[PDB]
Amino acid sequence: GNVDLVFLFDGSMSLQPDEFQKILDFMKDVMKKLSNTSYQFAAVQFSTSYKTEFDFSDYVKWKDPDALLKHVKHMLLLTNTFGAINYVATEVFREELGARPDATKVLIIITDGEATDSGNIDAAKDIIRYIIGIGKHFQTKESQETLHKFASKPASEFVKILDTFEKLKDLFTELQKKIY
């Protein structure tokens, strides 16, 4: 079956330059490793504001992860996760931007801290949502639990807590093995 997968990646000022680059490299590696007719991809950077770095039609045009993320600039502002998820639901998953009506909608949200906004993500309810919380800001159970509201259930499947950015590599096999 077809899968339309969006990477939604944190560009806040909490992220150090090497860490942000490891996130970009992870997205490129996932695209290279999942690449096949079934998958198409989009990517959105979120911080204070939201930017579609490439949409599904851009992916179809270029099919080159290096090219697709070449123009990304680290935003270095806040962490407005609620609005980011809603932005994906309403502004990225659109047929006019290359989204396929028959495809399973998937989000991989990548963040290094707690949200700086609030509200709800009801608009994104029909999207299968993974969230990856990385690093020292998720050392407490309480901080980890804040990510559950963003992800699909069960949290034991959909919420991934990684203690270091080096652990992103350990998610490749898992993501490759998903059958939606």
Swiss-Prot record:
Processing and modification events after translation: In resting T-cells, up to 40% of surface ITGAL is constitutively phosphorylated. Phosphorylation causes conformational changes needed for ligand binding and is necessary for activation by some physiological agents.
Highest rank taxon of the organism: Eukaryota
Positions glycosylated per UniProt: N36
Residue ranges annotated for the VWFA domain, each copy included: 4-175
Tissue: Leukocytes.
Localization (cell): Cell membrane
Family statement: Belongs to the integrin alpha chain family.
Role according to the record: Integrin ITGAL/ITGB2 is a receptor for ICAM1, ICAM2, ICAM3 and ICAM4. Integrin ITGAL/ITGB2 is a receptor for F11R. Integrin ITGAL/ITGB2 is a receptor for the secreted form of ubiquitin-like protein ISG15; the interaction is mediated by ITGAL. Involved in a variety of immune phenomena including leukocyte-endothelial cell interaction, cytotoxic T-cell mediated killing, and antibody dependent killing by granulocytes and monocytes. Contributes to natural killer cell cytotoxicity. Involved in leukocyte adhesion and transmigration of leukocytes including T-cells and neutrophils.
Notes concerning its domains: The integrin I-domain (insert) is a VWFA domain. Integrins with I-domains do not undergo protease cleavage. The I-domain is necessary and sufficient for interaction with ICAM1 and F11R.
Subunit structure of this chain's protein: Heterodimer of an alpha and a beta subunit. The ITGAL alpha subunit associates with the ITGB2 beta subunit. Interacts with THBD. Interacts with CD226. (Microbial infection) Interacts with SARS-CoV Orf7a protein.
Protein name per the record: Integrin alpha-L
Gene that specifies this protein: ITGAL
Parent-protein start and end of this portion: 153 to 332 of 1170
